Write an enzyme that holds these catalytic residues in place. Structure first.
Site, PDB file in Angstrom:
ATOM      1  N   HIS A 107     -91.979 -63.134  57.221  1.00 22.40           N
ATOM      2  CA  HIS A 107     -91.377 -61.909  56.762  1.00 22.40           C
ATOM      3  C   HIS A 107     -92.310 -61.098  55.830  1.00 22.40           C
ATOM      4  O   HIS A 107     -92.079 -61.042  54.697  1.00 22.40           O
ATOM      5  CB  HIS A 107     -90.023 -62.070  56.064  1.00 22.40           C
ATOM      6  CG  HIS A 107     -89.155 -60.845  55.977  1.00 22.40           C
ATOM      7  ND1 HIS A 107     -87.808 -60.943  56.033  1.00 22.40           N
ATOM      8  CD2 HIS A 107     -89.394 -59.543  55.750  1.00 22.40           C
ATOM      9  CE1 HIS A 107     -87.247 -59.772  55.886  1.00 22.40           C
ATOM     10  NE2 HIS A 107     -88.197 -58.889  55.721  1.00 22.40           N
TER      11      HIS A 107
ATOM     12  N   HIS B 294     -94.041 -57.607  55.077  1.00 22.60           N
ATOM     13  CA  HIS B 294     -94.234 -56.191  55.057  1.00 22.60           C
ATOM     14  C   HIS B 294     -95.699 -55.845  54.718  1.00 22.60           C
ATOM     15  O   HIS B 294     -96.160 -56.110  53.648  1.00 22.60           O
ATOM     16  CB  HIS B 294     -93.230 -55.458  54.129  1.00 22.60           C
ATOM     17  CG  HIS B 294     -91.830 -55.595  54.398  1.00 22.60           C
ATOM     18  ND1 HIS B 294     -91.012 -54.576  54.810  1.00 22.60           N
ATOM     19  CD2 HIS B 294     -91.022 -56.638  54.221  1.00 22.60           C
ATOM     20  CE1 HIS B 294     -89.845 -55.089  55.034  1.00 22.60           C
ATOM     21  NE2 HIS B 294     -89.816 -56.308  54.647  1.00 22.60           N
TER      22      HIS B 294
ATOM     23  N   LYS C 193     -88.494 -56.525  65.786  1.00 19.38           N
ATOM     24  CA  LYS C 193     -87.729 -56.509  64.573  1.00 19.38           C
ATOM     25  C   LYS C 193     -86.611 -55.406  64.737  1.00 19.38           C
ATOM     26  O   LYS C 193     -86.879 -54.301  65.078  1.00 19.38           O
ATOM     27  CB  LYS C 193     -88.579 -56.192  63.378  1.00 19.38           C
ATOM     28  CG  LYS C 193     -87.766 -55.979  62.116  1.00 19.38           C
ATOM     29  CD  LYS C 193     -87.171 -57.152  61.584  1.00 19.38           C
ATOM     30  CE  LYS C 193     -86.489 -57.016  60.270  1.00 19.38           C
ATOM     31  NZ  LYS C 193     -87.290 -56.650  59.138  1.00 19.38           N
TER      32      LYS C 193
ATOM     33  N   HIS D  70     -83.635 -53.891  62.673  1.00 18.58           N
ATOM     34  CA  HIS D  70     -83.360 -53.432  61.323  1.00 18.58           C
ATOM     35  C   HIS D  70     -82.307 -52.314  61.271  1.00 18.58           C
ATOM     36  O   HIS D  70     -82.388 -51.389  62.036  1.00 18.58           O
ATOM     37  CB  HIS D  70     -84.644 -52.953  60.512  1.00 18.58           C
ATOM     38  CG  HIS D  70     -84.560 -53.060  59.099  1.00 18.58           C
ATOM     39  ND1 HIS D  70     -83.788 -52.266  58.342  1.00 18.58           N
ATOM     40  CD2 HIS D  70     -85.122 -53.928  58.263  1.00 18.58           C
ATOM     41  CE1 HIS D  70     -83.880 -52.669  57.109  1.00 18.58           C
ATOM     42  NE2 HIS D  70     -84.640 -53.701  57.058  1.00 18.58           N
TER      43      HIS D  70
ATOM     44  N   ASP E 168     -81.927 -49.902  59.039  1.00 13.06           N
ATOM     45  CA  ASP E 168     -82.696 -48.736  58.732  1.00 13.06           C
ATOM     46  C   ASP E 168     -83.141 -47.895  59.899  1.00 13.06           C
ATOM     47  O   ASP E 168     -83.126 -46.711  59.792  1.00 13.06           O
ATOM     48  CB  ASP E 168     -83.759 -49.149  57.760  1.00 13.06           C
ATOM     49  CG  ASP E 168     -83.283 -49.413  56.314  1.00 13.06           C
ATOM     50  OD1 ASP E 168     -82.124 -49.601  56.024  1.00 13.06           O
ATOM     51  OD2 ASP E 168     -84.072 -49.395  55.392  1.00 13.06           O
TER      52      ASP E 168
ATOM     53  N   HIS F   2     -82.381 -58.085  60.696  1.00  8.71           N
ATOM     54  CA  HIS F   2     -81.811 -57.533  59.483  1.00  8.71           C
ATOM     55  C   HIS F   2     -80.557 -56.715  59.875  1.00  8.71           C
ATOM     56  O   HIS F   2     -80.624 -55.561  60.263  1.00  8.71           O
ATOM     57  CB  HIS F   2     -82.736 -56.651  58.725  1.00  8.71           C
ATOM     58  CG  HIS F   2     -82.246 -56.090  57.488  1.00  8.71           C
ATOM     59  ND1 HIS F   2     -82.920 -56.225  56.348  1.00  8.71           N
ATOM     60  CD2 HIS F   2     -81.208 -55.285  57.200  1.00  8.71           C
ATOM     61  CE1 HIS F   2     -82.277 -55.635  55.395  1.00  8.71           C
ATOM     62  NE2 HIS F   2     -81.301 -54.967  55.915  1.00  8.71           N
TER      63      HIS F   2
ATOM     64  N   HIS G 213     -83.357 -63.177  55.601  1.00  7.82           N
ATOM     65  CA  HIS G 213     -82.457 -63.180  54.437  1.00  7.82           C
ATOM     66  C   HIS G 213     -80.994 -63.462  54.871  1.00  7.82           C
ATOM     67  O   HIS G 213     -80.232 -62.601  54.721  1.00  7.82           O
ATOM     68  CB  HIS G 213     -82.565 -61.952  53.518  1.00  7.82           C
ATOM     69  CG  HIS G 213     -82.754 -60.708  54.281  1.00  7.82           C
ATOM     70  ND1 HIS G 213     -81.846 -60.305  55.182  1.00  7.82           N
ATOM     71  CD2 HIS G 213     -83.785 -59.844  54.357  1.00  7.82           C
ATOM     72  CE1 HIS G 213     -82.292 -59.210  55.778  1.00  7.82           C
ATOM     73  NE2 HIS G 213     -83.454 -58.936  55.295  1.00  7.82           N
TER      74      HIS G 213
ATOM     75  N   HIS H  75     -82.627 -48.771  46.800  1.00  8.78           N
ATOM     76  CA  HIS H  75     -81.888 -47.751  47.522  1.00  8.78           C
ATOM     77  C   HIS H  75     -81.623 -46.512  46.681  1.00  8.78           C
ATOM     78  O   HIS H  75     -80.642 -45.810  46.904  1.00  8.78           O
ATOM     79  CB  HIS H  75     -80.562 -48.289  48.042  1.00  8.78           C
ATOM     80  CG  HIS H  75     -80.679 -49.188  49.235  1.00  8.78           C
ATOM     81  ND1 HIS H  75     -79.588 -49.515  50.001  1.00  8.78           N
ATOM     82  CD2 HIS H  75     -81.735 -49.791  49.821  1.00  8.78           C
ATOM     83  CE1 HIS H  75     -79.957 -50.293  51.002  1.00  8.78           C
ATOM     84  NE2 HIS H  75     -81.266 -50.483  50.909  1.00  8.78           N
TER      85      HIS H  75
ATOM     86  N   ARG I  57     -73.139 -56.505  47.628  1.00  6.06           N
ATOM     87  CA  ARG I  57     -74.439 -56.862  48.103  1.00  6.06           C
ATOM     88  C   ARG I  57     -74.964 -58.046  47.336  1.00  6.06           C
ATOM     89  O   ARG I  57     -75.623 -58.866  47.915  1.00  6.06           O
ATOM     90  CB  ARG I  57     -75.319 -55.652  47.987  1.00  6.06           C
ATOM     91  CG  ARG I  57     -76.508 -55.689  48.607  1.00  6.06           C
ATOM     92  CD  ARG I  57     -76.420 -55.370  50.026  1.00  6.06           C
ATOM     93  NE  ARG I  57     -77.717 -55.599  50.560  1.00  6.06           N
ATOM     94  CZ  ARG I  57     -78.649 -54.668  50.605  1.00  6.06           C
ATOM     95  NH1 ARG I  57     -78.529 -53.415  50.213  1.00  6.06           N
ATOM     96  NH2 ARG I  57     -79.691 -55.057  51.057  1.00  6.06           N
TER      97      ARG I  57
ATOM     98  N   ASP J 137     -90.548 -61.461  52.336  1.00  4.62           N
ATOM     99  CA  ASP J 137     -90.052 -60.094  52.288  1.00  4.62           C
ATOM    100  C   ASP J 137     -90.990 -59.199  51.431  1.00  4.62           C
ATOM    101  O   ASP J 137     -90.541 -58.398  50.651  1.00  4.62           O
ATOM    102  CB  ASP J 137     -88.581 -60.002  51.824  1.00  4.62           C
ATOM    103  CG  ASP J 137     -87.811 -58.919  52.490  1.00  4.62           C
ATOM    104  OD1 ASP J 137     -88.314 -57.907  52.812  1.00  4.62           O
ATOM    105  OD2 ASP J 137     -86.633 -59.103  52.617  1.00  4.62           O
TER     106      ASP J 137
HETATM  107 NI    NI Z   1     -84.713 -57.266  55.821  1.00  5.43          NI
HETATM  108 NI    NI Z   2     -87.813 -57.137  55.033  1.00  2.00          NI
END
Ligand code: NI
Ligand code: NI
Ligand code: NI
Ligand code: NI
Lengths: 132, 564, 100, 564, 132, 100
Positions: D138, D140, D221, D223, D225, D250, D276, D324, D333, D357
């Site tokens: 994971h 980024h 992936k 996601h 988003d 995700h 996660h 966020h 959350r 992450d």
């Molecule tokens: Ni994620």
């Molecule tokens: Ni992530």
């Protein structure tokens, strides 16, 4: 003993073999409504057996016969038999057979509801002619 | 549910704790481990488990690692894995897995790599024994037809030499010189067995040895017939160490340049393979057997003395006297005392390999037969090996199996590719009916294809109708026979482009790991005791204990089974 | 000032020991990096001050105690080594078992 | 002769029965097996055993299988081999053997393949632990410098995505489209870690997925988003099965198109990797954790919740509210109950992998640290796992190790080449001092060369003088950095010539075995219990048992060791 | 115990380690006849040690010191020490050192005679200056 | 001392805040970098001192005022974030509107 075994023979132990022990068992009642004999094997997706078999099809969703691997059950015309059913293992992904599912046959995560893809399947059986 | 063993066995064959009789012998093997669970048993047939979307995966392309072949519910008898019940899987002519085969969609516990699919064919191993194919390290290339006799007893790899029926070949395992080697490499393309060729070791400088090395040999053979001198030995071994190839020896029977002790000193602690270690087949008389005490010696026996029988002395006498067109050479060559001793030492793990000496005193089609015959005669005379388990003969059997399988491989530096039923190895396999174990196989699987089999009437409505006799199969056909067969060579040769130069279509594989090995690297046959031989009476003492046994009248797997 | 790689590298030591000395003076028990810093700079500064290798060694083996460090740190610092610039040149200083 | 343990240990380190403390933790490992005999112990030095003609062979060329490198007298902590003492050998950037190293001329019991020679260099493992290098699933790709932070905690493989600090990368592990993929493949050539790249899964037909597959991704992936829809899932997984690549997810935190149960149904029993799994980092609120019950789900947690501490709730709250740019999304959350639950489930073997992450809520340089920190907090709270042995913590430790090593590999289909200390695998290895275990390694061995190390003053008279800090090494230099590093790709891509097309100098290796795997194929973390979450109080029940533990005040391997 | 072990520490069992147990032991008497210290390690071919060492060289043929791997014995000038000797293992092939053997050092197969390559070696030692 | 990239990076913070604290003590009004430094180190040092994330946060949101900074700097520092090493591990500290 050893003194008595034929050429290439086996001396077998005593202890019985226990199979499928963990797996939950559903009994269904099966009537053959056709004129011809129907025989079903151990790993066939019971849900998808010959249209002419009349049983609780919903109950056989994701199920197989709880018999010895490689063996079968014979359903002669106009006879009624009770059969033990058990779920498939692994990923519970069933592709092919009569093209009734072509997917996942698991329960999923919600106890005391049905997944909608199951209800779809069951509806589709009904109108393809698969007797319940 | 619950099922009886007897019913289970009938469906699936024997499981853990079950015992199998190996022929008409008194050897009983026992299944140690069952790798393929219970209740999800993979079997080919109408109405069975390896059908589309059920035991067989029907959605995966081959590049997902689906198998090309699966052998189901089989009893594996192997010197490294032991006695187990498993599914065996083949992909790209290689063993991909040993475990539980099927379809992970619908089944729990499928061994990774053992996914049965659209690509997969099947063999039903339920009532069968699976072995590694044997390896014959002492082949005289007298007759191309030997290959057929070999395949028919479960041997699929030949190490030796020759150039057809020349007087030199009739006596030795030599393919002399780069021309003859090239020729012979090219010829063997027509044979359905793996091959590696041996060269002539009797040379004074490096030149003549190097020559043959590059030309493609896997070894050098030092023979009396061409001179088994200290010189020969020394230069052969020095080159060998250079080339990562093996040296095999047939010592001076006449004691011309020396006694055994002097030979030993010529070895100069260097790795060596010693043929017919007993001496009936050649060697320093009476006492070549003492080389089996040394850590650098990888010992072999030829198969006509094993097992020791009542007709053995009569036969051998007369044989030499014709082998050498001939009496004090004879009765010194042929010694009841050392022959018995050979038998015992085998059973002890002191002689590490069986071999044929094909059409130069031994029997190319009898290595698997004789091995089993020996194990069984020896159980009778000696009882259970100390390391045996009380209920079974596994320890023993497995010692013997190592002799024709993994041990030869190790000796010639090919255990990386062949000799055991193990993951990553070439599928060079034999299937047997227990009833016929050692004697008469069902089939030979040669590079992942069935090359040889017992087949009846090709016109018949089944494969079983009479006459049933051994026949080539599709792996033995066309361009596949080369594709599925290996020609072993020197790294020197490989690197020099032997494959191109010689124009070989066979798989060409470099031998490796020949020179760092010792007796202790051998599998189940790693014992180095003190061996003494009496120069008068030829009596053998092994750590001070007289090493003898009595000859057999009746051999097992013998007149019951064979018309021959 | 024509700073060489060896010169520049030594600035890290000076920065971590300043932080470390501030912490010790607040009564904080020191960690591994911090403790190693203080011993290292003690040596280094001795060198600069004109002492012998022998003399700086002593000095550095005495700056920190068991009490001044976090439990276990001793086990993490069996010895400390640094090159310092003595009057006669660059020299290796080993400081044996500095946290007593 | 006879020697005391204490004296032996001082020379050679710990042997069978000896116990080692892993840092300042309360975890004690115990040596199960000692593979390297007694009395012929291979050590490098002046006046020692690995000298010419003695422990080292001095006559064999490299093509005899002499080693390129040997790591001596080392304690191997591996999820498949366990806790053993052995010599480890490397050849052609691969693990050739684990056993007894030396010279068979002068030594008994040298493991085949472990011949030390003229070719061989040496590492002294006596007082060291050897691990497989970690694998971070994971990542980024926000900052290239992450690689350095990773290597410095014993991680050497990255799986993820991005294109530097774009808003899309800041939130997701996606490298969108064939242009961006190509670019990113080319860039990573400059990095001293292995890499595989993930693509954008949110697509309606096959076209846009196939595109990226051929361009070289190892995965897709999915996601929120970019849309975590049923559609996305379904098409992504169908393609995946086609391409033999992985899918990571995700899930929808807002419950917009569905609840967790509907997501589950979108998976359609198909293999999937769930990031996660707890939900603090994203996912169906409150109850994404229930996916850990399913056999097709390969679950992971990100590392900021592990271990659960007293500052954990404060941190996370505030983090989202900035992540966020933001309160009823917040406190839904960030759930103390499920965070504790994550911790427990880890210890049970129900969550199978740790991950970072990286710079999207977790810590790229803390995966090995946090793993150990968690094991130790959990021992304290729960005691011995039932399968632990009374005197030692092996079962436990090994569960945890699987999490950052073999399990990630299996998930992304690279266990054939990396993730365990096993014969035939890429030597991607980490050396640790026990005193510093998990926290601060000695070195990283990356494709058979040392790429990264703790190094002091390059001007000094030794390698140890201060300042000691992590630095690239020669494997991290020149053309070797590419030679010693792998870029993982799709078979599709490999077959299409990605290596040529993209002009990559890295090793380019096809991912394989991603789609036939399930939770049960995971190592020491193969448990599928019933998981229930209370939609009011967020309480977690695992087979009916409340799954909680109390937060830690003090972490081990923490403020003692780090200035950070 | 566990409560007392330092960071990264070891808890060692009690049982002593036994090494080289099977191997036959030859004691030789060694005098250093030079002016400088001589130190010999565990795996060196004792036969081929520094010319200035005076001992029964014939007895050290194929031998090493029966000490712990990696350790050594120090022979100071003009001192006498008894040392335990043991044979090398494996193939008993010794290449290099002082180029006295460059071969096989085994006994071979004949109890109560010497192999001639051994006698060669021993003669060669003598005239290369290796003190006996 | 086996300094990791994260450890080394943090030396920059310590160096800039030392300069910044000297300047503030001369009565200089701080700039952007300097101000960010002081807030960052306040947190970091709290962490080390054993405080909670909650507690350090407060502390750091109170170290600098409008008066102590150059006009406008507030607008440049809406929030400050740093990872610090707390007793329970590394944790993110956000400090909201630190220049009040
Ligand atoms: Ni994620
Ligand atoms: Ni992530
Ligand atoms: Ni012969
Ligand atoms: Ni012959």
């Amino acid at each position: 003993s050893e003194q008595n075994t034929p050429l290439g023979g086996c001396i077998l132990a005593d202890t019985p073999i226990t199979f499928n022990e963990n797996k939950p068992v559903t009994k269904v009642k099966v009537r053959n409504t056709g004129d011809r004999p129907i025989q079903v094997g151990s790993h066939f997706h019971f849900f998808e057996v010959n249209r002419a078999l009349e049983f609780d099809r919903a109950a056989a969703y994701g199920k197989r016969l709880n018999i010895s691997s490689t063996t079968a059950i014979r359903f002669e015309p106009g006879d009624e038999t009770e059969v033990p059913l058990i779920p498939f293992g692994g990923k519970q992904t069933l592709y092919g057979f009569n093209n009734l599912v072509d997917g996942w046959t698991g329960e999923g995560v919600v106890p005391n509801s049905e997944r909608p893809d199951k209800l779809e399947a069951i509806r589709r059986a009904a109108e393809r002619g698969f007797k319940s | 549910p619950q099922i009886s063993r007897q019913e289970y066995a009938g469906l699936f064959g024997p499981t853990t704790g079950d015992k199998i009789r190996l022929g008409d012998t008194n050897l009983f093997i026992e299944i140690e481990k069952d790798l393929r669970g219970y209740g999800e048993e993979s079997v080919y047939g109408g109405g069975k488990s390896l059908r589309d979307g059920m035991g067989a995966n029907n959605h995966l392309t081959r590049d997902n690692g689906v198998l090309d072949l699966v052998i189901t519910n089989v009893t594996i008898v192997d010197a490294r894995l032991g006695v187990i019940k498993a599914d065996v899987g083949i992909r790209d002519g290689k063993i991909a897995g040993i475990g539980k085969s099927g379809n992970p969609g619908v089944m729990d516990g499928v061994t990774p790599g053992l996914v049965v699919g659209v690509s997969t064919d099947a063999i039903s191993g339920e009532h069968l024994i699976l072995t590694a194919a044997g390896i014959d390290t002492h082949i005289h290339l007298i007759s191309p037809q030997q290959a057929y006799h070999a395949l028919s007893n479960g041997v699929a790899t030949f190490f030796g030499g020759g150039i057809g029926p020349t007087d030199g070949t009739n006596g030795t395992t030599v393919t002399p010189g780069p021309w003859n080697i090239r020729q012979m490499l090219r010829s063997v393309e027509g044979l359905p067995v793996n091959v590696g060729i041996l060269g002539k070791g009797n040379s004074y400088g490096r030149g003549p040895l190097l020559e043959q090395a590059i030309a493609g040999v896997v070894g050098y053979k030092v023979h009396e017939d061409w001179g088994a001198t200290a010189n020969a030995l020394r230069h052969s071994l020095r080159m060998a160490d250079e080339m990562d190839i093996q040296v095999s020896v047939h010592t001076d029977s006449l004691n011309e340049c020396g006694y055994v002790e002097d030979t030993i000193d010529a070895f100069e602690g260097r790795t060596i393979h010693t043929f017919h270690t007993e001496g009936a087949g050649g060697g320093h008389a009476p006492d070549i057997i003492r080389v089996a005490s040394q850590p650098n010696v990888l010992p072999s026996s030829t198969n006509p003395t094993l097992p020791y029988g009542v007709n053995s002395q009569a036969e051998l006498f007369d044989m030499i006297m014709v082998c050498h067109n001939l009496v004090s050479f004879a009765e010194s060559r042929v010694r009841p005392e050392t022959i018995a001793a050979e038998n015992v030492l085998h059973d002890m793990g002191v002689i590490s390999m069986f071999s044929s000496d094909s059409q130069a005193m031994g029997r190319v089609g009898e290595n698997w037969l004789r091995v089993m015959q020996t194990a069984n005669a020896m159980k009778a005379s000696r009882g259970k090996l100390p390391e045996d388990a009380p209920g079974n003969d596994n320890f023993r059997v497995l010692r013997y199996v190592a002799k024709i399988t993994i041990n030869p491989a190790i000796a010639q530096g090919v255990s990386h590719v062949i000799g055991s039923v193990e993951v990553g190895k070439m599928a060079d396999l034999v299937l047997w009916d227990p009833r016929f174990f050692g004697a008469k196989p069902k089939m030979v699987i040669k590079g992942g294809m069935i090359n040889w089999a017992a087949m009846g009437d090709p016109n018949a409505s089944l494969p079983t109708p009479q006459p049933v006799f051994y026949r080539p199969m599709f792996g033995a056909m066309g361009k596949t026979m080369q594709d599925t067969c290996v020609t072993f060579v020197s790294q020197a040769a490989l690197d020099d482009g032997v494959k191109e130069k010689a124009g070989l279509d066979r798989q060409v594989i470099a031998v490796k790991n020949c020179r760092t090995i010792s007796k202790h690297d051998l599998v189940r046959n790693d014992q180095t005791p003190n061996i003494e031989v009496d120069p008068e009476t030829f009596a053998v003492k092994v750590d001070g204990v007289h090493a003898t046994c009595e000859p057999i009248d009746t051999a097992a797997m013998n007149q019951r089974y064979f018309f021959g | 000032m024509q700073l060489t790689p060896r010169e520049v590298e030594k600035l890290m030591i000076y920065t971590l020991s300043d932080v470390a000395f501030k912490r010790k003076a607040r009564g904080l028990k020191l960690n591994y990096p911090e403790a190693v810093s203080i011993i290292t700079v003690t040596a280094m500064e001795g060198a600069r001050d004109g002492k012998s290798v022998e003399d700086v060694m002593k000095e550095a083996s005495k700056v920190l105690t068991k009490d001044d460090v976090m439990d276990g740190v001793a086990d993490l610092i069996p010895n400390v080594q640094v090159e310092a610039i003595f009057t006669d040149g660059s020299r290796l200083v080993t400081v044996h078992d500095p946290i007593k």
